[PDB]
Ligand binder design. Structure first.
Ligand SMILES: CC(C)[C@@H](NC(=O)[C@H](CS)NC(=O)CCC[C@H](N)C(=O)O)S(=O)(=O)O
Ligand SMILES: [Fe+3]
Length: 330
């Protein structure tokens, strides 16, 4: 019943920001090898100040009041906010639900934006706390969105080259004016006593905070504090993913698995229950609402696939609802 440790290589992604094309191919090879193995890798030498990200996120989580949480709550917690399906605060439920979080979307989604004017699903205008009660928080959060957007764009060039495509194969659909990408600022608290109602038990007996799932994304670009919790499923069972609070943990989402005919799988993973204060800050790399990538199969000589091209917006709307139905309202 022992638990092994997943091979999660640390990949220096800095060449993806430069113009050394052979060096970028050597990064792409590493991304290919990781994507074909466990499906996770750590992006290092990424150029983002993750210490400031963790400090500002901690300041926000530890200073917001129950009044402000109701005022920012998504409609799952506040019936007055029917437009907040994605963005807003996700309340914990003491004695029942430990996790709480704050999700925000593309800062360019304003009342002027045509997708907001047309009321297209998955598009929302971000809600923010009072500036004086949380000085600099909105500025930090929006800046972080574009900081990790820049990193994610380079990572997408690595994935494109790894699959034998031109480096903009994915990134050309990843644009500041229409990206459905999201940031979630997740707090997992220390609780004494920790309520067993907030703990799930896996089929193999492991105590979990969040059950197995594939990510709803093209790729996921995640920062976490230094508390080990993640497990990836392999054919030989679940394996622990070691923590690293200096790098970004990268993995493919189910849209990537669809478009590559499962050549780059969306790794199934789950979150172990750990009674420790920690943060989990995912950036879900989503494309535009009408973004469509023609599927292909890198295993076939002609590279042809019979899978239907999937519009990303419909994929995202269906995927987020299915994840809530399967693993519960977060
Ligand atoms: C329970 C929770 C803390 C987990 N984190 C996540 O983000 C999970 C697993 S990937 N994903 C979501 O809840 C989709 C969010 C989409 C976002 N609202 C949007 O609209 O884009 S946990 O894995 O850390 O346990
Ligand atoms: Fe996930």
């Amino acid at each position: 019943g022992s638990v092994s440790k997943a091979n999660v290589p640390k990949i220096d992604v800095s060449p993806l920001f430069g113009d050394d094309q052979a060096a970028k191919m050597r990064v792409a090879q590493q991304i290919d090898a990781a994507s074909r193995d466990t499906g996770f890798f750590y992006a290092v030498n990424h150029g983002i100040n993750v210490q400031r990200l963790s400090q500002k996120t901690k300041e926000f989580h530890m200073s917001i009041t129950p009044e402000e949480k109701w005022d920012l709550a998504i409609r799952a917690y506040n019936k007055e906010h029917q437009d907040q399906v994605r963005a807003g605060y996700y309340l914990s439920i003491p004695g029942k639900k430990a996790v709480e979080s704050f999700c925000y979307l593309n800062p360019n989604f304003t009342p002027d934006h045509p997708r907001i004017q047309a009321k297209t699903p998955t598009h929302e205008v971000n809600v923010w706390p009072d500036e004086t009660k949380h000085p600099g928080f909105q500025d930090f959060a929006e800046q972080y969105y574009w900081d990790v957007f820049g990193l994610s764009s380079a990572l997408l060039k690595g994935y494109a080259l790894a699959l034998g495509k031109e480096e903009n194969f994915f990134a050309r659909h990843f644009k500041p004016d229409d990206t459905l990408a999201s940031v979630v600022l997740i707090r997992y608290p220390y609780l004494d006593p920790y309520p067993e109602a907030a703990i799930k038990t896996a089929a193999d007996g492991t105590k979990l905070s969040f059950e197995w799932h594939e990510d709803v994304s093209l790729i996921t670009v995640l920062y976490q504090s230094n508390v080990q919790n993640l497990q990836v499923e392999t054919a030989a069972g679940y394996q622990d993913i070691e923590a690293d609070d200096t790098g970004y943990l990268i993995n493919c989402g189910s849209y990537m698995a669809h478009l590559t005919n499962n050549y780059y799988k969306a790794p199934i993973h789950r979150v172990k229950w750990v009674n420790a204060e920690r943060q989990s800050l995912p950036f879900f790399v989503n494309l535009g609402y009408d973004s469509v990538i023609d599927p292909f199969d890198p295993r076939e000589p002609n590279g042809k696939s019979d899978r239907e091209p999937l519009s990303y917006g419909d994929y995202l709307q269906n995927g987020l609802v299915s994840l809530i139905n399967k693993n519960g309202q977060t």
